[PDB]
C-alpha cells in the first residue's frame, strides 16, 4: 500500500537460445495459459498450467503431449531440461544480454579434480585404495580424523589411482597431497 | 548554432562519455560500460537519468579548457524499476578521467541517495574508480565525507547493495564497508586502499594486483566480499534475482511472492540425513535445500568461514534468512570468522523484518592459541548479541549437537525465541557424557556403571525438553510444514523494548 | 539477555580478578569496559589441557589467557592493574566519570582549575620538520583539568589514544592520534579500539574531543588481507552516527580518507580548529605534483608553487573545512567554551529499528 | 616569508577590510564599520569570529587577481554574548565589493545559522548591501536560496532580529521579511527592490531615494519596519535592551529577571482615566505605562496603525506582550492596517511562550469603501485567528467599549482565554443603545420610554458578566495586582490541540 | 538549565559622562552596596541599597546624605536626574 508495483508492459520476449553449438532466435508472447513462440520462423503454441514447483511439468506443444523436467535453473541463463530421457543444457539470454555478452573474455580455467588434497589438518586413519584401484565420483578415498570427527575425503573424478602419497598413520596438514588420480 | 542544436550535441556527448577509443579499451578488457550495465540491470524502458548536463566547476590546472568538459562528470545516476519495483542506482564511468571522484561526482550520487531515503527506495551502486580527482584537491575529500554521511544515515532505513566491477582505491573503498552487502566480479574487480607500488615502498615484500586486492582474496580470506561472480553479465543477472528478496524499506514487511510449492508437504529425505554415529559428519546444505521453497537457496560467502552457512530463501512465498552450522567443516565448531559473518547477516535481516530460521549443530568452540590470541571471546559475543537483540520471528531447529555456551549463542529459546524444535538425535548438554562423568564421578568405584547410567539418562533430547528448553520433538520429515505454520502466525508479532539512544554491540 | 537489554541504558563495568572459563567469558564481551588484574586473572574459553589435546602446540596458563595477553595483543581487556587493592581503588575513581544512566547528562563535578587559562606549553610541541615525531600525550595532559587523564588500553594499538578526562568539571572522552607510533597511521587494531570507545561516549551523552594527526593508513598485505577496509569503516561510522558534541583539533597532518574518518566537520561536527602547522590535503605535495604535472618541463618550479600554495592550512579553511586557525596556547579555553554551549544541543535523525554498523 | 608571517598579514588585512580610504568614506557618511558595530553590540571580549580566512573561489572576469582577494569576503560572522546570554550575529561589510552577496558570503552566514538552530541561540543580522555580486552570476542566487531556506526553517525555533543600517536592494530585501522584527536607522537606511533609475524607466513618475525606500516610509506608511532609530550608536544601544526581553529559543520560557517593583501595589491613577462621556477619547498609553514594571514599555511601530498599540514590557520580572486599542485615533476602530500589525505581533509572542495582555476598547470597524475594497474581511480575520490559535496565557481587560464582532476579535474569553476583567465603565453589546432600540422597537408608540429602559438595563457591563463573559468587575486601581497574580499561576499551563501538518491562517 | 548564563567579569566601568557642555571622565567599580567612583581624579564613595523601582532613591556620598529622583532613562545614555530640586540632563 505504500509503494505500488507496476507490471512491465512487455509485449514480446526476444530471446537468444543457445543449444549445443548453435544460437537460435526465439520470440515468445503470453496469451494466458498459452505461449505463442516463433522458433526461427516456425510457429509453435505451448499450452500448460505452468505450475513451476512440480518436478513433472506437462505441456502440450501444437497438440503434441510432452512431459519435461526442469532439473536446474540459474540466473545466468543456464537451464537443464530433461527431454525424452536426455538432459539438454540450454542457455537462454535476452536479446540485450546476448548482444553484450560477446564482449566478455572467454577465459579458460583448469579442471583440478584428479589431485586430491587434505581439506583439514589431522591424522589419516584409512586409505581405501592402492595404485590401480578404480575410483568413482563421490567415492571415499581417505578418512582424516581431527577434533573427534571422522572427515571423509572423496574423489571428484572417475578414474584409477596412480599413486597414494599419504598412508594411514601419517599426519598431514592443510593442502597436503593425499592421492593422485588419472 | 541554435539553442536546440547545442542541446542535441550535449546529449550525444554525454552518451558517448570518454570517447569511443576509451570505450574500445573497456570492451577489449572484457568490461561493459556504465550505461550498458544499467540497461542490463533495470527493467527495459524504466530508467530515468538525472543531471545529465552537470559539469565540473574546477578551473585550475587547465581544467577550464573545453577539452576537459565531459557532461555527466564520470557517473551515471538515476532511477528505475526491477520487476516493477522502484530502485535508485548509480554506476561509475571509468572512461571519463579514470572514474575518479570529483566534488560534483559525489554530489550527483548524494542527491539520489537523498531521494531514495525520502521515498523509501533501495540504492544499488556499481563501483569502479581509481580514487580521488587530485586536480581539485580537497573538494573530492568533501565529496567522500558527504557520501559517507548518507551511507550511515540510510543504514536500517533502506538496504544498500554494492557491486564492485572494477578497481577501487583510496577513500572509495569505504563505501562498500558502510553498505549491507558487497559483491565482486572474479579476476576483474579489485579492492585495496593503496596499490602494490606503495606496499613495496613501505615494506620489503613482493605482491601483485590480484594478490593484494583481488576478488578471490576478499571472498575467501578477508571476509569482505559476500560473493564473486564470473563476469559482468552474470553478476548483474544474479543481482536482479537477489534484489527480488529484499523489501524496499525497513518500514515494509518481508516481501511475499506468488508461490506454487505447497506449504504442507512432507520431506521424507530429512529423516536419515543425520547419522547415529557421533563422529560422522554430514552436509547441512542438504537440509536447507530440501526445506526451502522449490529448493532455491541463495548462499552468501560460500568460500569464507565454511563452518557456518548463511543465506536467503523463501518459505511459502515469504523471504526468510537462514543461519546454520556446517558439521562437515571443523566439526561445526564456532570460531572468530564464523561469528563475524553470522552477526552481520543476522543484524541485516532483523533490521528489515526478515524472519530467521536457525539450524543448530555445534559442539562448542574451536580451541587453541590461534583463537584465544585473536579475541575469540570478543568476537563470539557478536553472534550472541546479534540474536539476542532481534525482534523478528526466530525459529530454531536443533539437528544433533548443542554443547556448552554455544547452545545459547546459536539462538536458543532463552534469547526471546518464538519456537524451538528438536529432532530425535538432538542432544543438549553442558558437555559430552565422557567429560561430564569423569568430572562428576571422580575417585569413585564402578565408574563404568556411572558412565552407562549417565549416557542413558542425559545423552538424548529429554533433559532439556522436560524443562521447557524445547517446544516439541518432531520427525524431521515434518520440519518444513512446522516452520511454514510458525512463519504465517508470527509475522504480525511485535515486542516492546526499553528506550535507547542506540545499541552498544561489543565489537 | 539482561546484559544485552541493559546496553545503552546503564553502563556496565566488569573487572576480572581471577580465572574465567566456559560461558562466563562472554559477559565481559557484552559489558562496556573490561579490566583485569596482572598475573592473577585469566580469560579463556578452554584450558591448556584442551588446547594440547586438539592441536600439537604447547601453552601455559599465563600464555593462553593471561592479563598481559589480553591488554597487549588481543585487545580484549581495557587495562590491567597490579593487584586486587589497587584495582578496586582505581575502579572507584573510574566510576566517578560515568553517568548513572543514559538518561542523565555527563556528570559535572566541582572544579578548581580555571577554564580560561592559557597553555603556552602547547605552542612548540609540534615540530616544523615533517619527519620528526612528537608525543600526543603531552597535549592531552596539558589541556585536561588538573592534568588528570585516564588512559584506556595503554599497551594495545598504541598509534591511537583514547580515554576519559574532565574539562571545567564535565566528563569528556578524548580520542587522538599518536604520531610517535607508526607515524600516526590508522590500522585494523586502532580502528577497533576507537569505534568502541566513541560508541560508548555517544550513548551516554559524554562529549568527544578529537586530536587529529594522521598521514593515512598503514600499507601492506598484512592489513589488506586482514580486512582493513571493513575495519576502518568502524571508526568512520562511530563518529558519523554520534549526536553528542564533537570538537576536533587538527595539530599537523590529515591526508587522504583519514581526514574524514577522524571526525571531520562534514560528519556533523560542531567545531573544528586547526593549529598553524595543520595541513589538509588528499596527499602530500610530492605525490600530488608528480601526478598532476606529468611529462611537463620545469617540474621543480611546479613543485615550489604547489608547496607554497597548498602545504598549509589555508585551502581547507577558506572552504569552510575549519572554523578558525588558533594559537595552540588558547586551545583549552576554546574547547571549554564550546563544551559549555553545546551541552544542550539536540539533533533529529530518521527513525530506525536499530543501527547497522559494518562490523 | 615564513608561514607565520603570512598568517599575520592575512589577519591584518581581514581587520582592515576594503581599505582605509573606503573606511574613511563610511565615517564621512556618518556610518560605523561592520566590525565597530559588533564591538558595540556584544559584551566586551565575548565575540569569537569564525572563518576569517575564507576567500571567494570565482576566477572569472579578473576575479582571480590578487588585488581582489579580500579575506572575510564582505561579511563579519561569529558568536558572542549580550549580558552573558549566547547570541549569534553577522554584519555585512560595505567596504569590500560594496557589500554585495557572493556564494561564499551566503555560506558563512548559513553556517552560523545552522549552529544557532542546533544549540538554540538567537540570530541578529545587521544588513547593508547593494545586492548580488553579478561577477559570479548564479552562485549568488544559490546563496540567497540557502539563506532563505534557513530563515524559514528557523521560524518558531529561535527568534530572528534584523536591523537594517544602510542600503538594501535585490534579493537581500526578503530576509527581513522572513525574520521576526525589522528595525531601521532614520535617513541612513533604505529598503527597496529596484532603485529610482528602474522606476523612472518603467513608469513616468519621479522619485528620490528617501521617497522610494526610506526609513520614514517603511515605519509610517508601508508597515514593514517596526521602528527606526536616530543613528547607528543609538540603534545598537536600543537593540541590546530589546534583546533582553526575548528567550533564546522557543523551548525556553519567557525570561524572568530580577525586579524591584512590588507586584501587589495599587495604581490609583487608573480609576479616572476613562471618561464617563462616550464621545470623549483618552490615551490608552497612560494605562499601559502605569501597569508595567517600573513604567518601562517598548513600543513597536509607534507611527504606523496608531489605532492599535503593541509592544513588550515586563510584569513581576517576566516578559509579556501587550496589545490594546487606542481610542485617541479613529475612535479605536479596527481597520486593515491595525489587523496586520496585531496578528504578526501576537503570533510571535505565542510561538515563544510570552504571555499576552489585551486592553480592549473597540467600537467596531472602520466603515467605507476604502476598507471594503481593500479586503477588510480578509485582513480582519488575521487578528481573530492569531488570538484564537494562541496557547500561551491570555489576560484581557475591557476598559470601555466592545461592540459587535470586534468583541471576539480582541481576544474574548470565548477564544480559550484564561481571565477577562471589566472595569466599571465597560459595555459589551452587539451595538450601541441607539441603534439597537431603533431596530428592536420599530413602529411602536412611546419609543422614548423603550430607549430609557434599554439603556438602564443593557448600557453597562452586567448583561455580559451574568452570562459568564467576564470573570469579575474590578476597580481599575487593582488591575496591575490582578494581572500579576494571573501571570504567576498560568505560566505552567498547557493545553492539547489536534494534530496538524501546519496552520492555515486566512492570509 | 539548558543555557547557563555567565556573568561578565567586568572589573571597571569606564564612562564618558556629558553634562551641559563638558564631557567628564568617570571610572566606577562595584564592591557590593558601595560604588567607588573616580570623577576626573576625585575619589567618591557612593553607598546605597539601589532599589531601582522607588521614585525616591536615597544615597550617601562620602557621608553626605542625598536624595535624588530618576525621572527618565533611555538606552541612548540619556538620564534625567532631579538633584537639589533642579532637573539635570546627563548623557
Ligand atoms: C579432545 O579431547 C579434543 C576435544 C575437542 C572437542 C570439541 S573441539 C571444540 C569444542 N571445545 C571443546 O572443549 N570440545 C569441543
Ligand atoms: C614511501 O613511499 C612510503 C609512503 C608511506 C607514507 C604513509 S604510510 C601510510 C600512508 N599511506 C600512504 O600511501 N602514505 C602514507
Ligand atoms: C454614524 O452613524 C456613523 C457611525 C459609526 C460609528 C462607529 S464607526 C465604526 C463602527 N461601525 C459602525 O457601524 N459603528 C461604529
Author numbering:
A (entry chain E): 547 to 728
B (entry chain F), D (entry chain D): 33 to 539
C (entry chain L): 181 to 539
E (entry chain C): 547 to 637
Question: Could you give the paper's own sentences about this structure?
Answer:
The cryo-EM structures of the PCC and MCC holoenzymes alone, referred to as PCC-apo and MCC-apo, were determined at resolutions of 3.02 Å and 2.29 Å, respectively ([Fig figs2], [Fig figs3], A to D and [Fig figs4], A to D, [Table tbls1] and [Table tbls2]). In human PCC holoenzyme, each α subunit binds to one β subunit containing the CT domain that can be divided into CT-N and CT-C subdomains ([Fig fig2]). The BC domain in the α subunit is situated on the CT-C subdomain, while the BCCP domain also attaches to the CT-C subdomain and positions the covalently linked biotin to a pocket adjacent to the propionyl-CoA binding pocket. The BT domain tightly interacts with both the CT-N and CT-C subdomains and functions as a hub to hold the BC and BCCP domains together with the CT domain ([Fig fig2]). A major difference between the PCC and MCC holoenzymes is that the three α subunits in each layer have no contact in the PCC holoenzyme but interact with each other in the MCC holoenzyme ([Fig fig1], A and B). Each α subunit in human PCC holoenzyme has a minor rotation relative to the corresponding α subunit in the bacteria PCC holoenzyme ([Fig fig1]). For human PCC holoenzyme, the structure in the acetyl-CoA-bound state closely resembles the structures in the apo and the propionyl-CoA-bound state. In these structures, the covalently linked biotin binds to a site (exo-site) that is distant from the catalytic residues in the CT domain, rendering it catalytically incompetent. However, we did not observe the relocation of biotin to an endo-site upon acyl-CoA binding in human PCC holoenzyme ([Fig fig3]).
Propionyl-CoA carboxylase (PCC) and 3-methylcrotonyl-CoA carboxylase (MCC) are biotin-dependent carboxylases (BDCs) that catalyze the metabolism of odd-chain fatty acids, cholesterol, and specific amino acids. In contrast, PCC and MCC have their BC, CT, and BCCP domains divided into two chains: the α subunits contain the BC and BCCP domains, with an intermediate BC-CT interaction (BT) domain between them, while the β subunits solely consist of the CT domain. In humans, PCC and MCC catalyze the carboxylation of propionyl-CoA and 3-methylcrotonyl-CoA (MC-CoA), respectively. (**A, B**) The side view (left) and top view (right) of human PCC holoenzyme (PCC-apo) (**A**) and MCC holoenzyme (MCC-apo) (**B**). Both holoenzymes are dodecamers consisting of six α subunits and six β subunits.
